[PDB]
Amino acid sequence: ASVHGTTYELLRRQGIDTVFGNPGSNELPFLKDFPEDFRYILALQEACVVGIADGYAQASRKPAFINLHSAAGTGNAMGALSNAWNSHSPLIVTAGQQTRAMIGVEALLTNVDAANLPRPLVKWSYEPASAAEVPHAMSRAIHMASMAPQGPVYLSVPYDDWDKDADPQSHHLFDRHVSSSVRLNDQDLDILVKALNSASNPAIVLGPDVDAANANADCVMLAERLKAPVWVAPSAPRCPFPTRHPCFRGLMPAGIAAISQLLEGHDVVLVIGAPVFRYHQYDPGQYLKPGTRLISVTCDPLEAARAPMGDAIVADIGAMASALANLVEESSRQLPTAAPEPAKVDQDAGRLHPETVFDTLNDMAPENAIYLNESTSTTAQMWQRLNMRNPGSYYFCAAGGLGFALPAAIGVQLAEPERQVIAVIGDGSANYSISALWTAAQYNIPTIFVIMNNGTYGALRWFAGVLEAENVPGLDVPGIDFRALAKGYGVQALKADNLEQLKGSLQEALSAKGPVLIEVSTVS
Amino acid sequence: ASVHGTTYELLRRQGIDTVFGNPGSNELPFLKDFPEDFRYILALQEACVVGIADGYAQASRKPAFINLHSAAGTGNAMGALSNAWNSHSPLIVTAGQQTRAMIGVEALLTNVDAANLPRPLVKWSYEPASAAEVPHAMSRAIHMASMAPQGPVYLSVPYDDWDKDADPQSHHLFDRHVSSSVRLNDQDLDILVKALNSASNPAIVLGPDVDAANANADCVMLAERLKAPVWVAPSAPRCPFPTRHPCFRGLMPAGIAAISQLLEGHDVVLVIGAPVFRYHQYDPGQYLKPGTRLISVTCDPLEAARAPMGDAIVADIGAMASALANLVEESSRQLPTAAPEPAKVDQDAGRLHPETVFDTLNDMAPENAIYLNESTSTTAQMWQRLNMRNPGSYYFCAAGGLGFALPAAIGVQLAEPERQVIAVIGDGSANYSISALWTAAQYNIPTIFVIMNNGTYGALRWFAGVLEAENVPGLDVPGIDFRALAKGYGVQALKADNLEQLKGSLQEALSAKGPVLIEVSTVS
Amino acid sequence: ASVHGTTYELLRRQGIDTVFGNPGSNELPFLKDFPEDFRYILALQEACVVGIADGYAQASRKPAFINLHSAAGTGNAMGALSNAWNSHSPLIVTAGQQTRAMIGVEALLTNVDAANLPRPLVKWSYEPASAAEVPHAMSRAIHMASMAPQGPVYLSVPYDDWDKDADPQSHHLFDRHVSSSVRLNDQDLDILVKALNSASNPAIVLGPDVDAANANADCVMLAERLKAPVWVAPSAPRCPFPTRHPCFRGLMPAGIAAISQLLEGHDVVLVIGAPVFRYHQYDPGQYLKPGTRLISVTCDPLEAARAPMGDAIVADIGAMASALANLVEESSRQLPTAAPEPAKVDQDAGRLHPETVFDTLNDMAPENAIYLNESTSTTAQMWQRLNMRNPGSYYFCAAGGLGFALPAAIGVQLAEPERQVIAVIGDGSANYSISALWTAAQYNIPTIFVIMNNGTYGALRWFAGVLEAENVPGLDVPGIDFRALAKGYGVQALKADNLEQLKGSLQEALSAKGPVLIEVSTVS
Ligand SMILES: Cc1ncc(C[n+]2csc(CCOP(=O)(O)OP(=O)(O)O)c2C)c(N)n1
Ligand SMILES: Cc1ncc(C[n+]2csc(CCOP(=O)(O)OP(=O)(O)O)c2C)c(N)n1
Ligand SMILES: Cc1ncc(C[n+]2csc(CCOP(=O)(O)OP(=O)(O)O)c2C)c(N)n1
Ligand SMILES: O=C(O)[C@H](O)c1ccccc1
Ligand SMILES: O=C(O)[C@H](O)c1ccccc1
Ligand SMILES: O=C(O)[C@H](O)c1ccccc1
Ligand SMILES: [Mg+2]
Ligand SMILES: [Mg+2]
Ligand SMILES: [Mg+2]
Ligand SMILES: [Mg+2]
Ligand SMILES: [Mg+2]
Secondary structure: OEHHHHHHHHHHHOOOOEEEEOOOHHHHHHHOOOOOOOEEEEOOOHHHHHHHHHHHHHHHOOOEEEEEEHHHHHHHOHHHHHHHHHOOOOEEEEEEEOOHHHHOOOOOOOOOOHHHOOOOOOOEEEOOOOHHHHHHHHHHHHHHHHOOOOOOEEEEEEOOOOOOEOOHHHHHHHOOOOOOOOOOOHHHHHHHHHHHHHOOOOEEEEOHHHHHOOOHHHHHHHHHHOOOOEEEOOOOOEOOOOOOOOOEEEEOOOOHHHHHHHHOOOOEEEEEOOOOOOOOOOOOOOOOOOOOEEEEEEOOHHHHHHOOOOEEEEOOHHHHHHHHHHHOOOOOOOOOOOOOOOOOOOOOOOOEOHHHHHHHHHHHOOOOOEEEEEOOOOHHHHHHHOOOOOOOOEEEOOOOOOOOHHHHHHHHHHHOOOOOEEEEEEOOHHHHOHHHHHHHHHOOOOOEEEEEEOOEOHHHHHHHHHOOOOOOOOOEOOOOOHHHHHHHOOOEEEEEOOHHHHHHHHHHHHHOOOOEEEEEEEOO | OEHHHHHHHHHHHOOOOEEEEOOOHHHHHHHOOOOOOOEEEEOOOHHHHHHHHHHHHHHHOOOEEEEEEHHHHHHHOHHHHHHHHHOOOOEEEEEEEOOHHHHOOOOOOOOOOHHHOOOOOOOEEEOOOOHHHHHHHHHHHHHHHHOOOOOOEEEEEEOOOOOOEOOHHHHHHHOOOEEOOEEEOHHHHHHHHHHHHHOOOOEEEEOHHHHHOOOHHHHHHHHHHHOOOEEEOOOOOEOOOOOOOOOEEEEOOOOHHHHHHHHOOOOEEEEEOOOOOOOOOOOOOOOOOOOOEEEEEEOOHHHHHHOOOOEEEEOOHHHHHHHHHHHOOOOOOOOOOOOOOOOOOOOOOOOEOHHHHHHHHHHHOOOOOEEEEEOOOOHHHHHHHOOOOOOOOEEEOOOOOOOOHHHHHHHHHHHOOOOOEEEEEEOOHHHHOHHHHHHHHHOOOOOEEEEEEOOEOHHHHHHHHHOOOOOOOOOEOOOOOHHHHHHHOOOEEEEEOOHHHHHHHHHHHHHOOOOEEEEEEEOO | OEHHHHHHHHHHHOOOOEEEEOOOHHHHHHHOOOOOOOEEEEOOOHHHHHHHHHHHHHHHOOOEEEEEEHHHHHHHOHHHHHHHHHOOOOEEEEEEEOOHHHOOOOOOOOOOOHHHOOOOOOOEEEOOOOHHHHHHHHHHHHHHHHOOOOOOEEEEEEOOOOOOEOOHHHHHHHOOOEEOOEEEOHHHHHHHHHHHHHOOOOEEEEOHHHHHOOOHHHHHHHHHHOOOOEEEOOOOOEOOOOOOOOOEEEEOOOOHHHHHHHHOOOOEEEEEOOOOOOOOOOOOOOOOOOOOEEEEEEOOHHHHHHOOOOEEEEOOHHHHHHHHHHHOOOOOOOOOOOOOOOOOOOOOOOOEOHHHHHHHHHHHOOOOOEEEEEOOOOHHHHHHHOOOOOOOOEEEOOOOOOOOHHHHHHHHHHHOOOOOEEEEEEOOHHHHOHHHHHHHHHOOOOOEEEEEEOOEOHHHHHHHHHOOOOOOOOOEOOOOOHHHHHHHOOOEEEEEOOHHHHHHHHHHHHHOOOOEEEEEEEOO
8 A cells, every 4th residue: 555545544534534725746646646535625825725724623623634835835824823723723734845855955845844844833743754654644643633632733744755655554543543532530520519519609711612622502501500600711712602691791801900800709710611811902900809719621731831820620621511511500599691782883874883784794694604703903892793692603813813714714614514604804804815715716615705894904003002102104904905806716796885785785695605705894 | 212212223224224014013012103214015914025025135135124923924924934045035024022921821912932933944033031132132133134144034022122221232233244245265266266277168057146146247257257158056046147148058957867967078067156956856867977076156054065066165155256257267268159049939819828928028028127937837938038138137936935926026126116027927826925916006116917827737737747647636726817806906907818918918017107917818 | 885884985085083972772773883994982971972072073173973872862962062062163963863663653762853852052953854865964964063153963863774775876975075264355354454454452352263273373473463462252162372472361251341341442352253252240331342343253153143242254263364364564563561470379288279270280281281171160260370372272161061171171182192181170060071081091091180179169159159149059069089980980090188299199190191080179
């Protein structure tokens, strides 16, 4: 058997059937004779390739396979990997290396010191010492990406390895099943449960890993039993709780002071599947107000280590959420009252306010719609005006790296063909991975792209204010015709300069059979 | 003064007055109060930012300053840096870090293990241990990028450093002048000169570093004195010799066997400013045929070390070229006869043959035009059909990383306002850094983009044929409207489906006052 | 031929004939059938192996070859490499890797992520992608270590590579000659020479690289022509000037303020072959007093970049020293007056004062003796009381890493069999690489070890006093019998509790035919 054959067998046996990539000569020996049980998804640029795969992996809750071209290709995807790292996305990144016979002279396309290139943005980076080792190395890649805490991995393979003979003993790799579905031991778990049962005024903070583990339901239960309010950890990469459940209290602002203020009065704060805490703006203060004790359940040792306060338990979020939900007692306290609906902002017949757009989307989008957010200055209003009842309904660049939403929305839509994906992207953000649109058109992936156009890097103008910065260059991005760009890549385009047009566009997009981009004129 | 003030003073004192970047919050403290003697060039995506700066640096022959946003921003430019590394481009890459007070918890936007991120694609990567150290660190960055062998450097700075007080002793950094303009010692230089004077049938091979050092003229002289043929080293990132000079013998094919064959019969082969040798395709054979001795003059120790044959001298290409040109004796041998003009290929009234395009470009483009090449399957014909008489007239992604030409052409044009830049880019390559177009429009940089559209990854289909590799997915890129894309970013667009239209388009583009993109229908 | 045969051929052809190492199974395939024209020097511990090789390389002024055992072996030598890096020691460090067939499972002895292990203490670190590449990789190692700035390199080789067939084209590696013997271009050199000729009160500061390039003589000339005082850069790893020459002004204290004070009044300060400046203690002040201009000639770009002041020229120290010495005019100024002999300290009939020891050594040691210093609290008196007239007469751990002197002295003695090597080592320092003594005994290398025994980490106690730091543990090292330790490794031992015994011991050691260790009772 060839390394080629054995590797594809390993891949299918491990459940992989899709390859996201952008071809190069170093990868031809791998891509040739592409198995009929596999499908290839092409993207015009590596940032888009990984972005799409990322969305696919996050939504499908299974690892995604990627194939890039040597250093340059890997390099173009580094930004995307920074996000994947923060979202614990199980991505298997493979890149073609020059033929071993020419790595020495460093012939064009030689990935020099390869394994070090994607570092420190991957859980594991490696290049086999021989062709027969490739299948084994691939096995390691697959599991390193899948084990908690999930994350991106990198494997570099010289192109002349594929045709070489594979080690017969490689078949032992095919059905290996590795599990990390673990939870705190019984004795210690009871101690925790008792603490929760004793809490006089508990509070729960949920992170992206909850949604990744599809522990949403269990968390809803846990929250109802403890009759506690639920917040989403700051800089939320995903939505781990139904935003209209009586317990939900929204997205926590990414500030130290802001959060300790919010948690004040709560004797026990239980954080699940989130870093403690992904702060953003500099909002100095107390990590926790006196009287508040924090307990963190994370799937990542690195998260537990850097938490500046509280205790931590490193385990599987799904296993823990389930266990806790079924052990805590039903508190006799009154279930929290649902937060009131947000106020309806004034809206004339001109350019739209973000609030108006979200309110409209909320009214017209299907209940199981999936949103992606890369409209950097409107995140707060968005989290308040969109009723997301189900899991996997929200995605935001986990590392703040723009250029994620657009390609990722295509991946998500590819993973969830039965759920309408709607990506709300700022006019500035839309440019980073604009070429991703082509993939949606080509494979007819019905993603809807709502471009919020205010002609400026809104969020930055905001920070400029708080940072009290003046004469800052490059904050405006005028002169971009998104309908023209959509046309450039074969995607139906619509324009919405006012509320009536927005409604009309949305209605048309919703019923359209292919991808659709709507350029919305928003207020600065 | 502040770290902010002192740094800008250091920058201007070191000749820097332009900042290429894409803003983020971590960089606001640095960009605020932007000095009036500086200019900011905004690009919609980091790959474009570095690409533009790269072209600017290569053409201006002076370092270029870049400002990116934390990890994600740096990550998006990794592909671009792979090229910069191969072309010895003096790029000073600076990226904003989170405020020191929040690096510990790893707040959103914290560049974790920062210095390791751009490795191994930079000569130096660093993050200061204190705010007062920033100016010094900046000084190191500037010089590390400028000293031979020039290359990209990385400096990460926590955003709260800028407002801090600078060390008064920093003024000692302002006017530091570091030189690496060195050449082989007298005794040894004479030994070399005598060897060249004794060569019965010498041959000269020139690399990108010759053009970078503007040693072109001196090399022409050297070639005429020795009455020797001149070749351009394989995978040429730049053109180091007038392509129509009687001695010129063209671009060497990137094959081991092909090159040793070419050099057979030449007793002494002098290679200047090039790696020995940037092979590409696997063309096994002898590094050198018996009877051929090789001598390499490189500015990079890494190049001299990995050369699989011949002797080497590590020194400044400019200094050496000059010295050699003035010391070698005038050989009595007959000056080589100029190569004959390439044949005119058959061309009907339909889609154009690449040859036709280049022949036309050669006839219509100004004599001091500057070309950029990212039409991967037509490089050979291009090098044969374009008469490039002057230095800095050709640029090709040094590492083979696509997405360079388009943004780089804008940088070159910005550096050479008096020379018409014409970038010939394949329809596939054009997508990688498509958003760069916006910058050309915004700053009205009159670059001309000629998109060779054959709807496929030509170079890849070719190779597929050698590998007789069949069933290779993702080799075609149909459905892209480049005129629409150009419109999307505000750039005048034209279409050329045949020779007459090509001529008309070129003529219009040439006289146009702003950037122009021409979509040319080429044969598959 | 085999990789084994071809590599040894490359080694001998490149002038290497000695292998310093400590064997392991991964290295057996390389060491078997050890060529008769090579010699192996065994050391009991890796820190000693590299230490010995380091001394050998520095004295012989040629690269030294080392062979260590996988990660653990490389690991034990990391401290030694830190010194080698600071002294620009051309060391070729090779370590045996597990067989390629077992690197995947990480069998015992697998050097994981090998190339990263010695980083950042090596100029180049690498592991070949195939057996046939080994000879080429070795070639790169040899040259990367030898080119300016010289330094240690690392090459990891799977043990199953040696028996594999070597690429026939490898013979092209055998006689490659790479040169970096370069100097500033003519035009710019004259500008420099004129500046020196115009200096009204020039000063010269010499570094270790001067002695490494054996540019001592030329510097003496240069100093006499300019009639300028000469200082040795702080933390001197070597002695670059005859310490009793009328111009010599001694070792500069490693303090910023101290040095700018020393240089005050000198309009032009020329620094050659030294970092600007290897400060040690925190002595804040001005880098240079107003009126002083500094010019640095360094062989290391990293040195030129971090210099906080002055101009710099990166070139070969030998070439530059020679050129300058023969171009500067003979100043009409009065040649500096030789510094007076140091005062003779009071010495009773008890424990000895360091001063007494040095005075005695100076009187009894041959004029071409070679000293090594690792008596951390007596460096100043030593530099004042030892008349070192010739080059390669002094060595001090370049990075301050103790455990260098003892093994290095053996290497130096092995390189200079005709010069008596005398290593003055503190009782604390002697322990770090104590086992090195065995090698001296085994190969009968007549090194003389003078242990300064005051039963305490003297230098640290000093610093403690500045910090007025009190209650610092682990500063005393009582209970060590060095004569017993010497006996343990088969080295003749002597004791000196007073001046008469010292004289007697030295006299006996000097005439002894093998290594000799003298334990000297010094005052605390
Ligand atoms: C790759 C990358 N480059 C730069 C940034 C910094 N940045 C953060 S928000 C922002 C503005 C983008 O705004 P847009 O999406 O147009 O909408 P708005 O800010 O008005 O919400 C920028 C440039 C980033 N996060 N990622
Ligand atoms: C960033 C990056 N991704 C992928 C590749 C691999 N690659 C090399 S040539 C090529 C084809 C691009 O072709 P195009 O420019 O459309 O024209 P051609 O000359 O090939 O017909 C590709 C995809 C690369 N070099 N760089
Ligand atoms: C490997 C290593 N460990 C620790 C130190 C720190 N250190 C510096 S000087 C010193 C004292 C050694 O003293 P000794 O050689 O006995 O003599 P004296 O200090 O009295 O001169 C120590 C422990 C070091 N430089 N290197
Ligand atoms: O795929 C390849 O071979 C490689 O990326 C390449 C091919 C042709 C031109 C530039 C770069
Ligand atoms: O610039 C920033 O602050 C940062 O990149 C950011 C801001 C807002 C949303 C996402 C990311
Ligand atoms: O040389 C080896 O094989 C290896 O270092 C080894 C061998 C036996 C015991 C421990 C370690
Ligand atoms: Mg990296
Ligand atoms: Mg905007
Ligand atoms: Mg094409
Ligand atoms: Mg290390
Ligand atoms: Mg002591």
